[PDB]
Amino acid sequence: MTGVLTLTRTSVGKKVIMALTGFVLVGFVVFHMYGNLKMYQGPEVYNAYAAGLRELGYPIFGHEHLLWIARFILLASVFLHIWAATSLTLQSRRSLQASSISTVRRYGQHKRQSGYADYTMRFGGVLIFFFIIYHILHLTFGVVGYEPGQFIHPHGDVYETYNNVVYGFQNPLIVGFYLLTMVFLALHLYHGVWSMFQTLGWNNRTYDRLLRGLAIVVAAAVFIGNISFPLAVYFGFVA
Amino acid sequence: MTGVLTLTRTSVGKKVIMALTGFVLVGFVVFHMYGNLKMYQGPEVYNAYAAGLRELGYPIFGHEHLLWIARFILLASVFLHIWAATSLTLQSRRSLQASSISTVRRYGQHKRQSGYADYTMRFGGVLIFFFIIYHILHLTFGVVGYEPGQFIHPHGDVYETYNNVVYGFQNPLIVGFYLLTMVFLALHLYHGVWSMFQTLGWNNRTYDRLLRGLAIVVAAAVFIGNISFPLAVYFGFVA
Amino acid sequence: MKITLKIWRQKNRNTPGEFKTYVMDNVNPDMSFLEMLDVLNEDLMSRGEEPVAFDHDCREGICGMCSLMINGVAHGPKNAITTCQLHMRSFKDGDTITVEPWRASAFPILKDLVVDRSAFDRIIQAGGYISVSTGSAPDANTIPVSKVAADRAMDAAACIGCGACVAACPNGSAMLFTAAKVTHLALLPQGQPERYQRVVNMVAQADFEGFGNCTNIGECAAVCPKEISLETIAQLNRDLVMAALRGIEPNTPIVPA
Numbered sequence: 099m100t101g102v103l104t105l106t107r108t109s110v111g112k113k114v115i116m117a118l119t120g121f122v123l124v125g126f127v128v129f130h131m132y133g134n135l136k137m138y139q140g141p142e143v144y145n146a147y148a149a150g151l152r153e154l155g156y157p158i159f160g161h162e163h164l165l166w167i168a169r170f171i172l173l174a175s176v177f178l179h180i181w182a183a184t185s186l187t188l189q190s191r192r193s194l195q196a197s198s199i200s201t202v203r204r205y206g207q208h209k210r211q212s213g214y215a216d217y218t219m220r221f222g223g224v225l226i227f228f229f230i231i232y233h234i235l236h237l238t239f240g241v242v243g244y245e246p247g248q249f250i251h252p253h254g255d256v257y258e259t260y261n262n263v264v265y266g267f268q269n270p271l272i273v274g275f276y277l278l279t280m281v282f283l284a285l286h287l288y289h290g291v292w293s294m295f296q297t298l299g300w301n302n303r304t305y306d307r308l309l310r311g312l313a314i315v316v317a318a319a320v321f322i323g324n325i326s327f328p329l330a331v332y333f334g335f336v337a
Numbered sequence: 338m339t340g341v342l343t344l345t346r347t348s349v350g351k352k353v354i355m356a357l358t359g360f361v362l363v364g365f366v367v368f369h370m371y372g373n374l375k376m377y378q379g380p381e382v383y384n385a386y387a388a389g390l391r392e393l394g395y396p397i398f399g400h401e402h403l404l405w406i407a408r409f410i411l412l413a414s415v416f417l418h419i420w421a422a423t424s425l426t427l428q429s430r431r432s433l434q435a436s437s438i439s440t441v442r443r444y445g446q447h448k449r450q451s452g453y454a455d456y457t458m459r460f461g462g463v464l465i466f467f468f469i470i471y472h473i474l475h476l477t478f479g480v481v482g483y484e485p486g487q488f489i490h491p492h493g494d495v496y497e498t499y500n501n502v503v504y505g506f507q508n509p510l511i512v513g514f515y516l517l518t519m520v521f522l523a524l525h526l527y528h529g530v531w532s533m534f535q536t537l538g539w540n541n542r543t544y545d546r547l548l549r550g551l552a553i554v555v556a557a558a559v560f561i562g563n564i565s566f567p568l569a570v571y572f573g574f575v576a
Numbered sequence: 577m578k579i580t581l582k583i584w585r586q587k588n589r590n591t592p593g594e595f596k597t598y599v600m601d602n603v604n605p606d607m608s609f610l611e612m613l614d615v616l617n618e619d620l621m622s623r624g625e626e627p628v629a630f631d632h633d634c635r636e637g638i639c640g641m642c643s644l645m646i647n648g649v650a651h652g653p654k655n656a657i658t659t660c661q662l663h664m665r666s667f668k669d670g671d672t673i674t675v676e677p678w679r680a681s682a683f684p685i686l687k688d689l690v691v692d693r694s695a696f697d698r699i700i701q702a703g704g705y706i707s708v709s710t711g712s713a714p715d716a717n718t719i720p721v722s723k724v725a726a727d728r729a730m731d732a733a734a735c736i737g738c739g740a741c742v743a744a745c746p747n748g749s750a751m752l753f754t755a756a757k758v759t760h761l762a763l764l765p766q767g768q769p770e771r772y773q774r775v776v777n778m779v780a781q782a783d784f785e786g787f788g789n790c791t792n793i794g795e796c797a798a799v800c801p802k803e804i805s806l807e808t809i810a811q812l813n814r815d816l817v818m819a820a821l822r823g824i825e826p827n828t829p830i831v832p833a
């Protein structure tokens with residue numbers, strides 16, 4: 099009688115919450131990569147994009163209103179995703195502790211015929227969480243992993259994100275960490291884009307191969323772009 | 338089993354394809370006429386509109402990003418429309434060849450009671466195809482219908498569409514061709530704007546007269562708007 | 577055929593088990609796996625050892641009592657067959673093969689290879705039926721059912737309750753079993769009046785029994801002996817979403833006696 103909050107009670111309801119949140123997060127990731135593609139055009143276009151994000155309909159919607167609304171929606175979605183992930187992972191871990199040879203091995207021999215989605219998805223989720231924290235702390239605020247006197251904060255209406263990026267991916271450790279995170283995110287998307295359509299029930303015999311192809315292409319595009327950025331910055335193609 | 342591509346197999350599916358394509362093409366025609374109405378304001382406003390087409394969502398999307406997407410959608414729709422029209426016309430020609438007096442007639446005497454839609458739609462479609470071929474080659478590219486040294490290509494970020502328009506409709510033959518094409522397109526819309534709703538099944542007793550009136554008003558508006566241009570340019574009212 | 581077997585051996589629930597090896601020198605290629613186990617049990621009894629215990633009633637792949645994990649694959653390496661149907665012409669001379677029970681928290685291990693699958697019965701007890709009493713049924717041809725709907729309902733309804741889907745997925749989820757029952761009851765008009773409650777109840781019961789969630793991996797469909805497809809899970813998800821939109825609340829869970 100509570101209503102749509104009934105999804106909190108059951109495991110399938112948590113999966114549905116996770117699917118909707120995954121829709122929002124996949125949309126954000128695709129749009130973010132598309133916007134970040136502009137760094138190849140030049141520093142002028144990149145800074146214009148960065149400035150225009152805040153002035154999204156500036157005469158009518160005020161300053162930074164839409165960006166703050168989008169940030170709030172993204173935070174809510176991420177928190178719901180994390181909560182459902184942790185709950186479901188703990189529940190599925192409880193289902194195996196009673197009957198297992200060891201705490202690290204379920205069967206004496208087990209051959210999988212449909213992929214390793216659980217391992218990849220969960221480990222990639224944890225890595226993506228840590229990467230999100232570090233990336234926000236490293237490029238939005240510029241207080242970690244950055245030489246002193248090299249970060250230019252937005253001073254009024256002028257943005258220097260091109261300078262921050264070209265001076266950000268210079269330590270090889272940072273670019274390696276970014277590449278690892280992007281590989282795991284590529285696998286994450288490659289499974290989740292189809293999984294979220296199946297979870298909501300928008301799947302049958304006809305559309306299964308189409309959805310698999312859509313997941314493949316989305317994951318490949320995101321992976322290619324997001325590994326092209328820091329590698330190009332490090333090697334000097336983007337200067 | 339294959340899914341939506343089942344519409345390719347039957348005649349009614351091809352008519353549904355034509356209906357959706359006609360929706361897109363009617364929308365484009367109306368929007369294009371509305372945009373071209375601006376040249377009565379003056380060269381400044383017309384050139385501003387032409388420039389702003391290539392810059393939609395300037396600080397979000399790239400240069401000529403939405404325009405190329407719209408161009409691709411228009412090409413896909415036009416190709417589907419042509420393919421379905423050719424297939425169905427050939428089929429209906431086959432249906433009337435075994436039993437028919439002579440070869441250009443069907444009945445010794447035949448009196449239609451519901452209008453000459455087939456002749457109008459088919460001949461207008463062929464004429465519109467040829468007109469589009471000439472139009473893209475006339476105003477967008479400027480390689481035919483021009484005395485040398487009169488068409489100013491878009492140089493950098495400036496546009497001279499007003500100059501090309503005022504130097505385009507000077508030959509009486511070209512303006513007459515435009516007259517004929519616009520008349521035939523007016524008839525085409527006057528039938529199609531209702532035929533699309535009937536073909537998609539969104540037609541009852543109540544909405545038949547409403548949809549017929551909507552078709553009449555759309556056809557008349559498009560006709561008047563698109564015929565006001567070449568006459569004004571030729572007579573010198575737009576200079 | 578000379579075959580080496582590694583059988584899981586556990587005395588009871590509390591006593592821990594271990595793997596034991598038995599070598600069989602002569603094996604008929606065309607006898608089924610369970611008959612090999614029977615010959616091994618006869619040899620063990622002759623020697624003076626404790627025979628291997630396993631579930632088997634029908635030996636036809638219909639009852640669903642047989643349940644074995646052979647070489648890491650449920651119901652043996654061949655697909656779309658049960659353990660009783662697995663004839664060992666599909667194995668190789670000198671092969672070493674391991675057999676284990678199902679492994680789940682909701683399927684306690686009772687003996688060497690026998691498990692407790694009463695959680696499936698409890699899942700069924702919480703809404704997996706049509707509440708029609710005897711004597712009140714109308715005439716058979718009162719409600720028409722299209723041939724396609726009846727065929728899909730029969731495809732979903734041919735579930736032998738073996739529990740291999742639970743032992744297939746890593747999460748240890750009974751999503752395929754629950755989805756098959758929900759789909760079978762939801763494709764007929766007689767199942768309409770209480771379907772949106774039904775699914776919710778059933779899902780809750782699974783969560784109450786100790787099963788995991790479904791990551792949409794798909795091992796269950798590849799292991800299932802009756803080719804129950806993933807469209808059943810999509811149908812269950814649609815039903816549960818629709819029930820949540822209606823404010824349907826799960827009832828009290830079915831506590832075991």
Ligand code: HEM
Binds near residue numbers: 259
């Ligand atoms: C290596 C490729 C990437 C680069 C170069 C990059 C760069 C940036 C930059 C410069 C900003 C600040 C935007 C601005 O100041 O206007 C930003 C914001 C952000 N990035 Fe990335 N990013 C990358 C990949 C990612 C990925 C894969 C994610 C997803 C996990 C991500 C999540 C974010 C988030 C959440 C923000 C903050 C958005 C906001 O607060 O409005 N980034 N990124």
Ligand code: HEM
Binds near residue numbers: 120123179186226227
């Ligand atoms: C980059 C942002 C992310 C996106 C776009 C994303 C996307 C998805 C999608 C679409 C699904 C499938 C949802 C469903 O089928 O119901 C999924 C599953 C999952 N995600 Fe994420 N995810 C992201 C980040 C994370 C994070 C940060 C974690 C955890 C720390 C995580 C852990 C999981 C887990 C555990 C699952 C499977 C749940 C299960 O056990 O069944 N993901 N993800």
Ligand code: HEM
Binds near residue numbers: 353426
């Ligand atoms: C100016 C762009 C055009 C528009 C907006 C347009 C619009 C329409 C519409 C709305 C219909 C009725 C759809 C239906 O009832 O399913 C239609 C039918 C038709 N159009 Fe077009 N059309 C255009 C160009 C063309 C072209 C270029 C051709 C052929 C070369 C053509 C030939 C036809 C034919 C032959 C039919 C009817 C065929 C049948 O009923 O089987 N049209 N058009």
Ligand code: HEM
Binds near residue numbers: 369502
């Ligand atoms: C006599 C009335 C018309 C005028 C004054 C006119 C004006 C123009 C001008 C100046 C251009 C070149 C600028 C550009 O490339 O965008 C153009 C292009 C074009 N016109 Fe027209 N036009 C007329 C009729 C039509 C009609 C009725 C249609 C609809 C079928 C049409 C479809 C197009 C298309 C598709 C382009 C190319 C746009 C592009 O993809 O770049 N024109 N028009």
Ligand SMILES: CCCCCCCCCCCCO[C@@H]1O[C@H](CO)[C@@H](O[C@H]2O[C@H](CO)[C@@H](O)[C@H](O)[C@H]2O)[C@H](O)[C@H]1O
Binds near residue numbers: 109181188
């Ligand atoms: C960044 C913010 C997010 C991180 C912090 C939150 C994550 C930490 C929580 C760990 C899990 C505890 O979360 C809690 O899980 C239990 C049991 O799994 C759920 O419990 C409920 O659902 C489960 C199955 O879904 C059933 O047993 C039953 O319906 C009910 O007990 C609670 O609804 C949830 O609140």
Ligand code: SF4
Binds near residue numbers: 738741752802
């Ligand atoms: S769904 Fe398949 S594997 Fe699961 S119990 Fe039923 S028949 Fe066995």
Ligand code: F3S
Binds near residue numbers: 792793796
């Ligand atoms: S393999 Fe397991 S994760 Fe779900 S889809 Fe089947 S129960």
Ligand code: FES
Binds near residue numbers: 631633642658659661
């Ligand atoms: S013993 Fe009955 S299904 Fe195998």
